[PDB]
Design a protein around this ligand. Sequence first.
Ligand SMILES: OC[C@H]1O[C@H](O)[C@H](O)[C@@H](O)[C@H]1O
Ligand SMILES: [Cl-]
Ligand SMILES: [Cl-]
Ligand SMILES: [Cl-]
Ligand SMILES: [Cl-]
Ligand SMILES: [Cl-]
Ligand SMILES: [Cl-]
Length: 190
Amino acid sequence: GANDYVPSPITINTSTLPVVVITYPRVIGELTGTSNQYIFNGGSLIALMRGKFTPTLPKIGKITYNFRQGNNTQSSDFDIFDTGVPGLGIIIGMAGYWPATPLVPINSSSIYIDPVAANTNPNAYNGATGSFGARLYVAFVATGRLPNGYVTIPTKQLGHILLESNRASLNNKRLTAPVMLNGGRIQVQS
Ligand SMILES: OC[C@H]1O[C@H](O)[C@H](O)[C@@H](O)[C@H]1O
Ligand SMILES: [Cl-]
Ligand SMILES: [Cl-]
Ligand SMILES: [Cl-]
Ligand SMILES: [Cl-]
Ligand SMILES: [Cl-]
Ligand SMILES: [Cl-]
């Protein structure tokens, strides 16, 4: 059907954090950034779309950081979210699918990750197309003293992306896609 877009998750993997070889808070490493071109896909009629991310984990505080990945030259403030594991939080950036769009630091209760223009123009959308995708960036943060050795991180839902469109019928579906931190094992060497 014309508006039969359906959501799919975008996921990033704890298992890509390098060994943490050892001040609070501080970033202890970055995961390998991921991308999904088809977070929303399947409607037969092209649409102008945008994605609003809402983080849904506890916000512990803020930290200044500049992702080695991505192409921001300046540091930004990021909200630290609680993984649930004591001493460990994460910071999140997200971006449009294509590499020219900027990494958007997650530092407010909700934000448009693509197009970033929508954060200041409420009538700004992506150019008409048949899908909506994104890039996901995550770094782990030490919020407190870490013990030596292996630590298991549970799989966590970092938040969701809400699909918005200037087509009322598609917009009012309020389609949402989860943004997932796939759990795994990290190692601390102190
Ligand atoms: O394939 C084109 C398509 O790729 C992704 O899904 C983007 O999010 C869209 O804006 C569009 O560029
Ligand atoms: Cl994915
Ligand atoms: Cl990966
Ligand atoms: Cl993809
Ligand atoms: Cl950055
Ligand atoms: Cl969760
Ligand atoms: Cl309409």
